[PDB]
């Protein structure tokens, strides 16, 4: 395995851990805030993904400091990951156009 491919793999593993830990902690931050809805694990899990993907429907979102601090980590994980895959694909493609020119 080439590095770009390892780091994407690493980032996909690490993204999943962030999505799960994120779900757990979002519920743990958000319970105790009256009106908070991000307060059960299953939909937390859905929230974490709609967050890391930057889709962000807003059906759900945090309203407490630590919710928001957890949310900011999920986003960054999301964006970094979905930009290391791109960087990896860009390096795979560049490699293949180098061979198709003889280099």
């Amino acid at each position, epitope marked *: 395995s080439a590095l770009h491919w390892r780091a994407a793999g690493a980032a996909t593993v690490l993204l999943v851990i962030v999505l799960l830990a994120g779900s*757990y902690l979002a*519920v*743990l931050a*958000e*319970r*105790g*805030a*009256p*009106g*908070a*809805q991000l*307060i*059960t*694990y*299953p939909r937390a899990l859905w929230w974490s993904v709609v967050t890391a993907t930057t889709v962000g429907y807003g059906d759900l979102y945090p309203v407490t400091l630590w919710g928001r601090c957890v949310a900011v980590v999920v986003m960054v994980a999301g964006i970094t990951s979905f930009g290391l895959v791109t960087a990896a694909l860009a390096t795979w493609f560049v490699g293949r156009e180098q061979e198709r020119r003889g280099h």
Partner: antibody
Amino acid sequence: QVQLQQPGAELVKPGASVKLSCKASGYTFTSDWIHWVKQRPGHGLEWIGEIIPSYGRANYNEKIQKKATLTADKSSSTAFMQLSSLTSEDSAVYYCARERGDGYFAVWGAGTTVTVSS
Amino acid sequence: DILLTQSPAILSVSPGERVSFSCRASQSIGTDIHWYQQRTNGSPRLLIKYASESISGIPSRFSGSGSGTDFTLSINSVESEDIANYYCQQSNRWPFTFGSGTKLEIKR
């Protein structure tokens, strides 16, 4: 196998305090919340508070006076609720109940009848 | 804090007849309503979760229905064992809240 095990009764002198136990058997998870629910005679169910024994965080009913303080013993699988400086208002049955963090109370204890008198 | 309203408080039905209990949320809670039975001197017992879903253990005689603000627990053909106090309970917004409750009462 009875999952939530609670004392039948505690007598308490007005002004005094009391620690209610709730020993849990069956599947435990990290995810699990223990809840406490107050029922005065001929009245209905009131949500007091919740604790997650794994991380030890608890939350309580703002909407009522904050008599209670919640604790767990990770090792002995027990939740405690500490009701302090009681009066006859506080004379009720206190149920504990297990919620998997998915919103419903799947299982309840038999509750503890707490009587505040001299 | 979401307000659960159970009218009527008492429900008089005849043996084997269909009965429905109403639970209205002060604001849309989706399907995040749960129904409990409490007989005299008993602890609460989950009948229905997320408005409609069966609990295994519970008679098929029990169903729920509803979305947003209007919810409904129904018993097709009531019998004596059904005599108890019914409560609804929301999980949609912190903190969880309960219905004031409704008494099922059979005229025999």
